[PDB]
Design a protein around this ligand. Structure first.
Ligand code: P5S
Ligand code: P5S
Ligand code: P5S
Ligand code: POV
Ligand code: POV
Ligand code: POV
Ligand code: ATP
Ligand code: ATP
Ligand code: ATP
Ligand code: K
Lengths: 331, 332, 330
């Protein structure tokens, strides 16, 4: 419609796949699919797995008792293989007791028939296997940290202002939790339908972008909010963005990828956000945020994304660097 | 007469081994081995471990009951140490009830013989220890991602074509799941028999290859299918290749390694693929795939690996660069 | 031979620490300690933890039964609180049944004395917590990936030889299992004594060394046994080595670190090795180890660390640059 976003502001992407030759890999990764599922759906499969297993073996216990004929009334002329089985519902309760390992012991397993002994072995092994598998799935779900990515907070929209003479595309990212993100990393990409002289056409060319770090690396130590900018050098594809060329249907998008292993669970998480063409404010520096109180600092997240207007030329970066060079040479 | 591949098209590293002076690498690390196995083998060992423990302690319970003298039909002052034991079947079922902790209670342990108490303690500790170990293997087997690694897709044959002036070696990677692979990192290698002037003989010299990314680094953000093109500079070992020297029996291979951690299980993975000489379609470009739907993008995977020919100067990268410099000098 | 290596050929950093203010942080972190310990030590602590809990609550159950008096040899006149408690052994077996959750049911808990219900709650919670903790520690001890790191193989004695004219220090590294090591990473640090002009005397100075990789990175894909070689440039602290200076009584050592997560367990590992001066063979090359089977490639691990001899200039690499410049000038 108006303009498709590659990744939504909340971090979820919007790309739609089509014409996939389903090889069953979606079904093949049973354990991975369970982890992805929501907790209500996980609990439904959890309940259905146990209930189906309990009911399946309950029918088997009823079947073996019916075949042995020990459920019909008897007077001392018989010894049932599973004691006190005089109804199907008794077999159902017996199945619960075995697999859950409750073992009330009112419905025992006698030494008489060997088939019930084999079925008891099978039910115990199957119960342990399913318990172990559900543990694994629950342990991977309780170790999920995608809900940690939500606590990572970016500015509502980014700016482009002059700093140290040159021009840079600024940005702010914040963390709300008290915990730390070990080995953090901020990638940054521009997504443009970039045409090439040789004749190629790319529907969405993803150009990587440096983080303008001190040592030219991707490492970032994120405790307070930081003005994470990108120096618009000659090679930067943002070198030719006219401020007059900032309107809606300008084919632009600034991906941001904040990575880093969460300290608590030890799981790595991504944070994503895309700045559109009309979501950029030219020449507006960010409001200072990190105040100081008595013996301690103070971050004012109320002013997290407020930007004040600062004067700057309304010229493309090419029209700025070239002009400055000519003036210096003439002088 | 059999052209050997260093890795198969689905990873599957096809390199054998010989003369291994093993010191029990199978042994003293059995936990990694159990993770390696399939589920049929895991189930068999799962059942075998429990059945061996159950049957072993069952014999012990039977033996101690017979030692106390309770199997024989004596109703006078027998006071059996393990109640209601009257065969091996009762002993085996009792061993089930202890180690599995079912505890039916029709076969109890009384205070008579303290040796039964010691055996009960041993079986409980062994049963808990084995349950703990088997749980751990299950956790490490449910957090596997080889079944996810198979979802990553690389085109059947990569192309060489001009892009932005120079010559590059394109490719196409793809993901087939809604989940993301955090911190992807594509390392590319050229495998060849390259011998140094000094006489060194290296049969498979794995030379690394830059990804020609915009920031030098390798980390690539993979949602849509992407072109992974290596720009053939004057240093790249591809700088001396022409489509005339690109028949089948030509010693080349382009290993591609797609690293990255799955966001769900938090386990790092790898996807691998190779490209022989014949499987590098010279002078062709990939078809654009990302269309636009009513309100979002449309990756038409049916056109994932189709290429359309576009003519290019059929010369080596060294000849191309030399000819361009000579033509520019003549013009200037 | 008082030579003191920095690390052994199989890791095991041979450095003794002394005068440590051990303020309990070793003992405060119990779970990490329990992971480090061997299996015989773990089993002893495993058994002792459970047995201490069993005996402790056995005393508690026996004590409350005595206090209620329901263990008196007289049978009737009342109804007991915890049934079938006759001797201490009954109380201990009852403790087993509760904490292990076997629950035979011949020794139940009735409504008589409320303190039994409270003690039952305490024992159940404590038993579950101890079981949960031991499960976690066992799980961490099953994802140990140092035994796998013991199957990473480094050649016993590494070499220095001329390749592409320049002079480089080589090394052979290999894997034995069928499982890859994802995101491998080779670091190489020289341990030497540094006496800077400003008077600094660093006893064990570690200068990192570039691996001379085709992309300038420090990552390599290892399936077949690789050849790792550092190209000795004008900035490498090996730029002034000579075959004379390469005997036993030398302050040289080349620590090599092979990192990377193992694919199965998902655990990051290291493989540490060192090459003393006398453990180097100047001017010798590695035998081609990768053969070709009729159908696929081959690896001849019998000729792993075999180094043939080859002619080589017996002079420092610095002099090679000076001679090279003089040759061009001539
Ligand atoms: C296994 C139950 C058997 C029947 C017994 C019923 C009695 C239930 C009480 C005891 C339940 C045990 C409590 C355990 C506490 C665990 C907490 C937990 O797992 O997270 C609480 C959950 C999480 O929701 P979420 O954040 O939206 O999910 C993750 C996210 N959406 C994602 O995609 O990662 O938040 C919830 O979800 C609420 C949890 C309450 C559980 C109630 C389960 C019944 C669900 C019925 C749903 C029917 C309709 C489903 C439609 C879903 C459409 C999407
Ligand atoms: C008394 C106890 C009896 C048994 C009780 C069973 C109780 C069941 C309880 C619940 C079961 C839970 C099932 C788990 C669901 C997920 C399973 C799953 O994802 O994998 C399915 C597994 C096996 O796949 P894989 O080997 O890992 O696949 C290869 C590779 N990883 C890939 O996927 O890409 O496949 C399975 O889940 C099972 C498949 C069984 C197949 C048995 C085959 C016989 C074994 C020997 C075969 C080879 C023989 C020789 C052949 C030579 C050929 C040259
Ligand atoms: C009161 C109730 C008692 C109950 C007793 C039975 C308990 C049964 C438990 C069943 C499960 C056992 C789990 C073992 C499975 C894996 C074993 C394995 O892979 O390693 C086998 C181990 C040897 O490894 P390590 O170097 O000590 O530790 C591993 C590594 N270094 C790590 O960090 O993980 O070595 C072993 O685990 C094997 C030990 C065999 C013991 C045989 C007895 C005679 C030899 C005794 C050996 C020396 C003992 C010295 C004691 C000194 C104490 C200070
Ligand atoms: C969750 C269940 C617990 C609650 C159950 C409530 C309904 C009672 C059902 C019931 O009595 O079952 C009946 C059958 O039952 C069947 O045949 C069940 C058929 C469906 C089972 C499989 C479902 C999938 C009981 O059958 P029975 O005991 O074999 O009947 C003979 C009884 N006699 C030996 C005393 C003569
Ligand atoms: C799935 C299957 C599980 C089935 C479990 C029960 C199988 C044995 C049943 C059986 O007849 O036991 C026999 C023992 O038998 C032994 O003592 C066997 C000794 C060899 C065991 C080898 C295991 C491997 C019978 O036991 P008994 O001691 O001969 O009986 C005493 C006589 N009395 C009954 C009059 C008191
Ligand atoms: C496995 C093992 C249990 C012991 C096996 C032998 C059984 C006799 C134990 C015994 O008499 O203990 C006694 C003390 O003993 C204690 O209170 C010991 C407490 C610590 C025991 C473990 C560490 C040593 C407990 O005596 P009692 O049960 O109060 O005696 C009541 C008398 N009546 C049995 C005649 C009714
Ligand atoms: N075929 C092989 N399989 C597995 N590991 C091997 C093999 N050959 C050597 N190794 C490993 O390589 C190392 C020893 O390498 P190297 O062959 O140079 O020494 P060596 O056999 O001890 O020497 P030598 O016996 O000639 O004194 C050890 O870690 C050893 O386990
Ligand atoms: N629509 C698709 N959905 C899923 N996987 C696809 C799809 N198209 C191609 N692939 C995968 O891409 C690889 C080859 O792509 P390409 O289309 O270039 O060749 P192909 O003729 O489909 O290959 P093959 O004969 O191996 O199936 C294979 O791993 C294949 O499974
Ligand atoms: N032997 C030691 N063992 C453990 N930690 C130590 C040791 N010596 C110093 N530290 C650590 O060094 C840090 C600085 O401690 P502090 O400056 O008070 O002592 P110091 O450096 O040993 O003093 P001094 O100058 O008297 O030798 C603290 O974090 C302390 O724990
Ligand atoms: K029980």
């Amino acid at each position: 419609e108006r303009r498709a976003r590659f990744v939504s502001k909340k971090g979820n992407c919007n790309v739609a796949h089509k014409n996939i030759r389903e090889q069953g890999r979606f079904l093949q990764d049973v354990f991975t699919t369970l982890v992805d599922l929501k907790w209500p759906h996980t609990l439904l499969i959890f309940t259905m797995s146990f209930l189906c297993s309990w009911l399946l073996f309950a029918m088997v216990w009823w079947l073996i008792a019916f075949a042995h004929g020990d459920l019909a009334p008897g007077e001392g002329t018989n010894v049932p293989c599973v004691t006190s089985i005089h109804s199907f519902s008794s077999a159902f309760l017996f199945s619960i007791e075995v697999q859950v390992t409750i073992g009330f012991g009112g419905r025992m397993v006698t030494e008489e028939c060997p088939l019930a002994i084999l079925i008891l072995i099978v039910q115990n092994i199957v119960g342990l296997m399913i318990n172990a598998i559900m543990l694994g799935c629950i342990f991977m779900k309780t170790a999920q940290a995608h809900r940690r990515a939500e606590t990572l907070i970016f500015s509502k929209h980014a700016v482009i202002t002059l700093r140290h003479g040159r021009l840079c595309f600024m940005l702010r990212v914040g963390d709300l939790r008290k915990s730390m993100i070990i080995s953090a990393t901020i990638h940054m990409q521009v997504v443009r339908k970039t045409t090439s002289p040789e004749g190629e056409v790319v529907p969405l060319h993803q150009v990587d972008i440096p983080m303008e770090n001190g040592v030219g690396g991707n490492s970032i130590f994120l405790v307070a909010p930081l003005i994470i900018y990108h120096v618009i050098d000659s090679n930067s594809p943002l070198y030719d963005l006219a401020p007059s060329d900032l309107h809606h249907h300008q084919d632009l998008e600034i991906i941001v990828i904040l990575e880093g292993v969460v300290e608590t669970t030890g799981i790595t998480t991504q944070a994503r956000t895309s700045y559109l063409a009309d979501e950029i404010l030219w020449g507006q520096r960010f409001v200072p945020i990190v105040a100081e109180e008595d013996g301690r600092y103070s971050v004012d997240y109320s002013k997290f994304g407020n930007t004040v207007k600062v004067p700057t030329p309304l010229c493309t970066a090419r029209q700025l660097d070239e002009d400055r060079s000519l003036l210096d040479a003439l002088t």
